[PDB]
Design a protein around this ligand. Sequence first.
Ligand SMILES: [Hg+2]
Lengths: 94, 264
Amino acid sequence: MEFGFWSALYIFVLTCFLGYELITRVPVILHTPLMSGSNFIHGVVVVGAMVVLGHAETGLEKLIGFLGVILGAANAAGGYAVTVRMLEMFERKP
Amino acid sequence: MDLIQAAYFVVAILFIVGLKRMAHPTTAKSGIVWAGWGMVLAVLATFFWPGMGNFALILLALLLGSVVAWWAAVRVAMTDMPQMVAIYNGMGGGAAATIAAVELLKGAFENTGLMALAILGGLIGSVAFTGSLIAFAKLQGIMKSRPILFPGQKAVNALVLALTVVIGLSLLWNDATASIVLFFLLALLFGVLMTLPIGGGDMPVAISFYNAFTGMAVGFEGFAVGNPALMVAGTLVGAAGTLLTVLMARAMNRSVWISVLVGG
Ligand SMILES: [Hg+2]
């Protein structure tokens, strides 16, 4: 929806269909890991919190940007960690 | 900045393939690894944004949040994983809101459909944030698991929702930093109000829902500011998340409307 309007709009919808399409046919046993890893993926928020923190002037901007980035990074770090732990339930003990 | 662009495009591919692989028995384990790099690349590459500063505050913030979360994730019992996924998804919502909120304080857009988008993101994300924390609270028995009911709440929630949206819109014409805070508080409040009625045992579905929520929230935040990394990934997950929510509901032999209340 920007850079520029039409192009971006295709990008929204193309991704919406694709997001959807990849997930159809997931077995039930894979629900929650999928859930965990997609949770991880949206962790990219940091990158936008980053840019916000790194362009902040007034200082109320500092704090909330700082939060943003802490929140962001938890999302990623945690997500990754959790998904890995979930995935190990599938492995035999050697 | 075709370089940052190159990196974000590869990041996009890494996420897609990664999400694709998380979805199949034989590829699942490697999926998260692929998505892994996507993030590395994304984070690295974003240091190179033009006009970037406050690095120390950035590192400090990256280190704190990544370390405390990883530490927690690695120590909890397996049977407490649903709530963990919840808290980490909360914080994403928050993230999307923090983005939204700072660009607003900077009245950084003369394009108003973009302002719109940021705001929409800020609402959804704030909601996914507090809604995920309440979910957490219930699974942890910090809060009553059962649906928490009160005399005429269905209306209060609608009413709080509508007020929020309205003051949300209000920012387009007028955005006294006063009204900004009000908007988030209402958004946040509504997250809380929303999840009170959700039974403990319904929670994995609501968690998926909020996952979809934050996904969408970041995608929106992504378009509004010009960030492709976010644009693609947010919606990807927003999309896949909403479908996932539907199949989870179905697996529980339950409807998502059913979950979203179970008593008003
Ligand atoms: Hg779609």
